[PDB]
Amino acid sequence: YPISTYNHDRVNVFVANALVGAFLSNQAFYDLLPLLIVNDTMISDLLGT
Amino acid sequence: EVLLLPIDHQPANVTTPTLDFTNELTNWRARVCELMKNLVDNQRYQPGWTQSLVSSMRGTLGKLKLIKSMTPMYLQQLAPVELAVIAPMLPFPPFQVP
Amino acid sequence: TQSLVSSMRGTLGKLKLIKSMTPMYLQQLAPVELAVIAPMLPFPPFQVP
Amino acid sequence: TTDPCAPVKAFMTLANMMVGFETIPMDNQIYTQSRRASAFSTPHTWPRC
């Protein structure tokens, strides 16, 4: 993610915690990275993903 | 509309299954092998076992901890789906205390 | 040989740690048996301390 | 061999040898660490580590 275009948008807390926990455990964290920037609410992305 | 299972169940995410080492049954086997190697490393509990029997027992136990087994993964993420499919086609329904 | 010394003082340790019931029998049950046999004898017990 | 995926087969052979000793970040949960090294044969399937 470029910082200069993604400076002022809110990030997703579940994806953040699960991303840190997956990177510390080496458990294929790359499929979480598209879910890191959130839209339309925090919970419906995780529902309808 | 609920069954009870004495072990944990997460469901799988793929249909091509491979081997990994993250479930409570392999964790349990790892902790049992870890305590038995802590037990056999002590010399006061088996003084007759000199050197090579001790190291061979350590290696047999670590290898047995690291066997390529698939039954714990099967119990973790495939067999509860099968029990849930079977259980309504059954003449005596489930009868479970917690 | 230093292997054999430690290994077969291990044998002495295991023979110390053998399981047998003859000592508990001699402590607890055989005196009761001698006490119930000893009135029923043609030769009564004749003891020095 | 003139296979262009010979280095990634050489790396994934060791990564299939070392399962449970050391874990690496793979790409996804399909092409895992314990998957056989033969199946790759394609630059799309090279692991990110």
Rounded to whole angstroms, the Cα distance separating D34 from D23 reads 10
Reduced to 3 states (helix: H, G, I; strand: E, B; else coil), residue B93 is coil
Reduced to 3 states (helix: H, G, I; strand: E, B; else coil), residue B35 is helix
Rounded to whole angstroms, the Cα distance separating A39 from B4 reads 37
Tokens for C17, please give them.
């740690």
Give chain A positions within 8 Å (CB) of D25: 23, 26-30
Residue environment code for A7-29, b if the CB has 16+ CB neighbours within 10 A, otherwise e: eeeeebeebeebbeebeeeebbb
Instruction: Please tell me which residue of chain B has the smallest CA distance to D33.
Output: B20
Chains with ≥3 Cβ pairs under 8 A against A? D
- Size of chain C in residues: 49
For residue C46, report the phi and psi dihedrals to the nearest 5 degrees. Answer: -125, 105
B20/D34 Cβ within 8 A: yes
Rounded to whole angstroms, the Cα distance separating D9 from C45 reads 92
Spatial CB neighbours of D1, under 8 Å, sequence gap ≥ 6: none
B21/D20 Cβ within 8 A: yes
Experimental method reported for this structure? cryo-EM
Rounded to whole angstroms, the Cα distance separating C46 from C44 reads 6
Spatial CB neighbours of B51, under 8 Å, sequence gap ≥ 6: C3
D32/B66 Cβ within 8 A: no
- Classify burial at B26, counting beta carbons within 10 Å of its beta carbon; exposed 0-12, middle 13-18, buried 19 or more: buried
CA-CA-CA-CA dihedral for B51, B52, B54, B58, to nearest 10? 140
How far is CA B95 from each of CA B59, B75, B86, rounded to the nearest angstrom? Answer: 45, 21, 15
Rounded to whole angstroms, the Cα distance separating B5 from A8 reads 46
